[PDB]
Structures are given as structure tokens and as C-alpha cells.
């Protein structure tokens, strides 16, 4: 199974805008929510600082997504679904994907409770839910922070097993190659890269530079 080429995906994450939480009161649940929100904002900040040949393909795709208009088109694409095939302006057809949706949870659940009742939370399941949802973003941030924004092998925090197989079942390849790549997913994690690309227009996007074996 000789790796002869690359297939650059694009993995997005809908971020939120943390508007200043104007509520006074330091109950334990509110304090834990505040600590998690602070860790979230810190993750976004370190990622923005992380942004601001084996990865030549991912580098090129990152420079293309930095052009004005491209994120808009990807966002419109992955709008109602959680997977699309957007064709970038330079002719290449990239396979976007939306592996996490944190804007939804943060806004809809947290922001009302934080703003209306002056930060009075009732149950303790919401804080565990939020830290569970946020741990994946924090761990992507940690991996990028340590590896200088280019991570190999692609861990299970970047691209889980179900999502790696959903990516493999949509690549433009024969059925034999899909079968091979689905039977050796650990060797496909050990052979790719995860370039960190952009934070812009309220979204986090990184490029997963999967391999493709033309010789089998």
C-alpha cells in the first residue's frame, strides 16, 4: 500500500463570541461555568496566536482559505449538513466537514442562563456537560500548542475513528482503496498530518492531510 499522493480535507468548528458576562454572584456552579468559559476563551486566544516538503499541500490549502471569501463559501456549504464538498476558487475540490458544534451549545444553553436570571444556575449536570463538550477543543489546543501548529500522527481528538471513516467513505477513490483504508485506520493516522489553518469569521478550521495509496 504505497502512499503516492495526498488528499487535503478541511475540518471546521463553529466557535462562539463570548460577550462579557455581566452578572454578579459567585455561586459554585456559576464559578465553575465561568472557569470553563475562561478556559474556552484562552483556547481561542492561543489558537489565534498559533496561526498568526510534507505539508506543502496543506500549506497551499491554508493560504487559499486565507483569501477573502473562502471561509464564507465553506460556511454556507456546511450549513444544514455536517459534510460537504466545496470547490475552492483555484479549481481544487476540497472535502469540508464540521466535526464539532460548540457555538450551538454555548449560545443556546449557556447564554440565556448567564444573562437573564443574573447567573443563577439550577442543576449541576450543565457544568459537567459543558466541560465534556469543551475538553475536545482544549485538547486540540494543547496538541497544537505543543507541536507548533502541525500535528502528526492525527490523534483521536483531531479526527475520531467514526469521522475518519466517514471521511474515507467520501474520498474520490476506488472501492478497494476505501476498503483498505477502512481496514487499517491506525496506519492511516500514522501517515498523515493535521495542519492548523485559520480562525476567521467565527470559525476554527484545520486541514487534515490524509494519504492516498495509488499502488495496491
Amino acid at each position, epitope marked *: 500500500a504505497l502512499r503516492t499522493g495526498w488528499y487535503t480535507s478541511v475540518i471546521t468548528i463553529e466557535l462562539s463570541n463570548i460577550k462579557e458576562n455581566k452578572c454578579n454572584g459567585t455561586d459554585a456552579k456559576v464559578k465553575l461555568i465561568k472557569q470553563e468559559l475562561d478556559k474556552y476563551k484562552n483556547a481561542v486566544t492561543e489558537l489565534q496566536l498559533l496561526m498568526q516538503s510534507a505539508i506543502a499541500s496543506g500549506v497551499a490549502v491554508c493560504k487559499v482559505l486565507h483569501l477573502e*471569501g473562502e471561509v464564507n463559501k465553506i460556511k454556507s456549504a456546511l450549513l444544514s449538513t455536517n459534510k460537504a464538498v466545496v470547490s475552492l*476558487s483555484n479549481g481544487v475540490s476540497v472535502l469540508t466537514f464540521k466535526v464539532l458544534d460548540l457555538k450551538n451549545y454555548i449560545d443556546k444553553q449557556l447564554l440565556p442562563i448567564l444573562n437573564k436570571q443574573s447567573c443563577s444556575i439550577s442543576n449541576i449536570e450543565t457544568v459537567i456537560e459543558f466541560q465534556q463538550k469543551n475538553n475536545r477543543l482544549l485538547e486540540i489546543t494543547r496538541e497544537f500548542s505543543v507541536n507548533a501548529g502541525v500535528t502528526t500522527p492525527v490523534s483521536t481528538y483531531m479526527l475520531t475513528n467514526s469521522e475518519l471513516l466517514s471521511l474515507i467513505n467520501d474520498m474520490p477513490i476506488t472501492n478497494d482503496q476505501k476498503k483498505l483504508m477502512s481496514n487499517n485506520v491506525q496506519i492511516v493516522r500514522q501517515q498523515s498530518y493535521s495542519i492548523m489553518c485559520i480562525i476567521k469569521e467565527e470559525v476554527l478550521a484545520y486541514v487534515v492531510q490524509l494519504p492516498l495509496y495509488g499502488v495496491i
Partner: antibody
Amino acid sequence: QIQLVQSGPELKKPGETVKISCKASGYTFTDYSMHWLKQAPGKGLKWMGWITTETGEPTYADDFKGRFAFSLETSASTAYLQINNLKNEDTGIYFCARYYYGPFYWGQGTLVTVST
Amino acid sequence: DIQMTQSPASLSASVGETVTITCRSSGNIHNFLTWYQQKQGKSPQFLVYNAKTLADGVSSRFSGSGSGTQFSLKINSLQPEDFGIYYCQHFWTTPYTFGGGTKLEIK
């Protein structure tokens, strides 16, 4: 809740200088670069350019090069345009917009008429 | 420099008919196109996020379709509200262009 309130109406004379401002509330101003859209009486809508809200670097459409100048104040969260050497043809409605999911978001216009 | 053209430069319909507007791109804008409607002296409010997936807040009678070089907005029923001027724009690559405009008036 994303708002882009714009300046008021104006009346100038050919050969003057004008500055139209666009205030942007409801989001982190530094996320989306702001785009400028010119309308015209009877003609169609015209997109003229944008200005990045991080570096301020502007870029212009080939019909709106030479005199139009975009600028912003990151702190105030507002961006403005400047149309040097007004002419009888620069009359119309000038729009400030940013990228929504697919389409734009238009703030109210500023009818800028140039008569003598 | 993809330039768009709308076929019904004028229009006239009843208060219960279904009317269909079309745009033809001068290039392959794969899927990216949108339809604004401008009321009597307002700012163009968009109706669809994309050629197909309409935008939240609007009524369900608007139904867009198309891909590549032939797109179609369909007002499945007219009311006093659905009257104005309808433009169409690509957002595939810069500079962005609009259709000539489709003026819709009562029959």
C-alpha cells in the same frame, strides 16, 4: 441582533470631499472584514471593495480605483469611506456590508447627492 | 468577472399566482448564489443562504433551485408583501456581481 448603522444623508458640490461612516455592533468587529456596496438611481447594485478589519489593508474593484478610500477605527468599532473629488456621477446610495453565512448584511443607506 | 443576467427584466402577477425568476451566470458558480429583495426604499434583505437552502425568517413559499449556470427562484404564492425588486448575486469569487433586477408589480 447584528447591526450596521450608517451615517446620515448628505448634500455636497462637485469637487468636494466626503466621508461616510458605518458603525458595526452585535459581533466582534475584528472577525469579519467589511464590504462596501454602491447603488445608483435606476442602475444596478455595484460592489466596490472591502477592507480587512485586522490590518486595515483595503482592496478595490476595478471601477472604484483612484479616489475612493476605506478606513476604520478598530477601537471605536466603526469603519468609514472617503470619496475624494466628488462628481455629478458619484450620486446615489452607498452601503456597508459584511459576510453573513452566504449573503450580505446591508445597513441602511446614505443618499449622497452631488449637485451644484 | 462572472456577469449575471436575469430573464424577466419586468414582471407582473396576481395575488395568488406562482411566478418564477431565473438567473444565468457567465461562468460556473458551482452552487453559490443568493436572492435579495428590496422594498420601497430599504436595504436589500436576502431570501436564501444558497441556491437551495432558503434563509430562516422568510416564508416557505420562496424556493430556490439550480447549480452551475442556471438558477431559479420561485415564489409559490404572491401576497401584498412579496412585491419589490429581486436581485441575484454570486459569492463564488471577487468581484461580486448582481443581476439586472426584476421588478415585480401587481397584475
